[PDB]
């Protein structure tokens, strides 16, 4: 009856918001491109408070954390490639020959032995040097004259060879007065009212791995194998599937390469590819044929829920596009692999091996372009020795064509980050609350 | 006892959440947010630092102009206009949560903030006149 306003400071009520999220990492100390050394040390007690009785709305396709992480990683690469060598003197005429012929016909031009005149420490004296270059980094003139692939479109900057491309787990944290809400639902779609909800000061360890078609070293589902798209009935929205079991993949470049430094100026050194020690072999990836078929069947079962128990779905290879998107492109120990995936997506499944593995022939590039802008390209310096990385395929990036058929792709870097930030949501705290009660001042 | 944690009683009743306000009050300025290097992570963290103190003080500013400085539960002299919410006390504190309550009181939150503001200006003027003898 006699009710006055009563003010409460610290009321458990929040509103959706966009904020700046800083980075947290764990103690490991050289310096990765992700600059994880500059992040606040993560708490050894990753506190998670469960919000009983709460039911929050999520929408991974409007999430701001993925748009923020997309710009952060790009800025980390921009920040790391600023102080490194500009290879504009390399855009010169190249006299190229195949290196060590006689193997398997048109697989000898895949890597060339190119010699060229180069600036020295003295501005008035040239040097004739040579370097080994892959075929995907050179184009002909129309004679055996070649040039680097980027010379007409982009300037090129080689990465400072002391930096590490190895992804390091990044934790995203909201500032004080804000919060991160995680969706604990083990069969969560990506959108809609998530029943189980918990709050965290920081997100889990997210490795910033940029890969195509196949999502590597990511997180796994706890039940079934979810499939996430904003309009699955629309064929132009990428399907993001997420395995619960990891199908292992082994990639390698068996060629034992040597890095030869070339002084192109005062303080400037270009890291060329000396020669190949031992056999000139083919870089490739293995994946267990048994596990890939089993995991590809689970995707079929969950795809049935969106297209009918009777329909037939088929897997085909990429239908075109840029080289980065038509292949399983990724980074393995420094070099950028570009793996043919026609052997992984070549299956038709009906309405209703066991020993060997399926191999994937990969080509290798050194002059890789920036995905967003045009006119900006990086030179990956040559990695010495034999390369071999072992990682998990924990998801896919598929595409429907409109009985059913699904092919891979996905050149958008933020589709990678959606596969890890779908659980999280940024909200701001509003601790001021007014409510009636029979309490009066004085 | 219980101790649900930070926002642990977000789904509890308003009366039950009204007993764990220190749990949220202490995390409004701390966390993990020593040199200022202006890298991509350094600029990001600096903004995270200034943003926390900014929002923290804006709430303390309103809490000051209402005469509720350093209070978690202060009572006022602004009566409850039933047009704000005709719900009864028992169906408010033993029923609703603070989240859904703020959802329905949202229109009048700026109206109430003005009544608490001038009520404090006039109350301090009254206290000065009473101490003028």
């Amino acid at each position, epitope marked *: 009856e006699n009710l006055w306003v009563t003010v409460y400071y610290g009321v458990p009520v929040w509103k959706d918001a966009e904020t700046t999220l800083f980075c947290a990492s764990d103690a490991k100390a050289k310096h990765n491109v992700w600059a994880t050394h500059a992040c606040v040390p993560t708490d050894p007690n990753p506190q998670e408070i469960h919000l009983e*009785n709460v039911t929050e709305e999520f929408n991974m396709w409007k999430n701001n954390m993925v748009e923020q992480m997309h710009t952060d990683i790009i800025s980390l690469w921009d920040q790391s490639l600023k102080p490194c060598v500009k290879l504009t003197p390399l855009c010169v005429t190249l006299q190229c020959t195949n290196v060590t012929n006689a193997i398997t016909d048109d697989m000898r031009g895949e890597l060339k032995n190119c010699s060229f005149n180069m600036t020295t420490e003295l501005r008035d004296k040239k040097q004739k040097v040579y370097s080994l270059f892959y075929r995907l980094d050179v184009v002909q003139i129309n004679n055996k004259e070649y040039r680097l692939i980027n010379c007409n479109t982009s300037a090129i900057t080689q990465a400072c060879p002391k930096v590490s491309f190895e992804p390091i787990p990044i934790h995203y944290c909201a500032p004080a007065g804000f919060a991160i809400l995680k969706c604990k639902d083990k069969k969560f779609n990506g959108t809609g009212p998530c029943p189980s909800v918990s709050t965290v000061q920081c997100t889990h360890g997210i490795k910033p791995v940029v890969s195509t078609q196949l999502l590597l070293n990511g997180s796994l589902a706890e039940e079934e194998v979810m499939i996430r798209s904003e309009n699955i009935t629309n064929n132009a929205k990428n399907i993001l599937v997420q395995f619960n079991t990891p199908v292992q993949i082994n990639c390698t470049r068996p060629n034992n390469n040597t890095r030869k430094s070339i002084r192109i100026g005062p303080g400037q050194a270009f890291y060329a590819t000396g020669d190949i020690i031992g056999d000139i072999r083919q870089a490739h990836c293995n994946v267990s044929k048994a596990t890939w078929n089993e995991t590809l069947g689970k995707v079929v079962k969950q795809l049935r829920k969106h297209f009918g128990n009777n329909t037939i779905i088929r897997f085909a290879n990429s239908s075109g596009g840029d080289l980065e998107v038509t292949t399983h492109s990724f980074n393995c120990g420094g070099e950028f692999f570009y793996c043919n995936t026609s052997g992984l997506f070549n299956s038709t499944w009906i309405s209703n091996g066991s020993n060997d593995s399926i191999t994937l022939p990969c080509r290798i590039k050194q002059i890789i372009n920036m995905w967003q802008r045009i006119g900006q390209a990086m030179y990956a310096p040559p990695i010495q020795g034999v390369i071999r990385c072992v990682s998990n395929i924990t998801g896919l990036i598929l595409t429907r064509d409109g009985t059913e058929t699904f092919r891979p792709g996905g050149g958008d870097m933020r589709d990678n980050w959606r596969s890890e930030l779908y659980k999280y949501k940024v909200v701001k705290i509003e601790p001021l609350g007014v409510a009636p009660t029979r309490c009066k001042r004085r | 006892a219980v101790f649900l944690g930070f926002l642990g009683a977000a789904g509890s009743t308003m009366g039950a959440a009204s007993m764990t306000l220190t749990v949220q009050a202490r995390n409004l300025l701390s966390g993990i947010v020593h040199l200022l290097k202006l890298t991509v992570w350094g600029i990001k963290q600096l903004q995270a630092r200034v943003l926390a103190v900014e929002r923290y003080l804006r709430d303390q500013q309103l809490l000051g102009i209402w005469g509720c400085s350093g209070k978690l539960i202060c009572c006022t002299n602004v009566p409850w206009n039933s047009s704000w919410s005709n719900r009864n006390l028992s169906e408010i504190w033993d029923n609703m949560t603070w989240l859904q309550w703020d959802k329905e009181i949202s229109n009048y939150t700026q109206i109430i903030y003005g009544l608490l503001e001038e009520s404090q200006n006039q109350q301090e003027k009254n206290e000065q006149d009473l101490l003028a003898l």
Partner: nanobody
Amino acid sequence: QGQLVQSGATTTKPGSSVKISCKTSGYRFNFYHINWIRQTAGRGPEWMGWISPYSGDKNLAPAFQDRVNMTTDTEVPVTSFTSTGAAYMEIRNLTSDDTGTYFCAKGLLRDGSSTWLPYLWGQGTLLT
């Protein structure tokens, strides 16, 4: 708001065991108890029992102590504060003297002294 639609009003004969459903909407099904009330013609209206759609805890009268099974299945999040639920009712050593109209009503408040009190009722079902 809040709605509680009940099952059909079909009839059986003594010795059997019928199931009564109660489907909820417009409110969080977990936040309030679910009561079962009987309005017999040859007796005053009787409270049969309530159950917790959140904690599963049930409480029925000693007259129905070992004769009734009360069950509810987990809700379905519709919005942040809305969900759909269902409550079930069974009878064991059943006769024809248990004839009448049966209702389902949800609790009153989420806390206090009148927590489980039957507040919002259904349209009822006729029996044998």
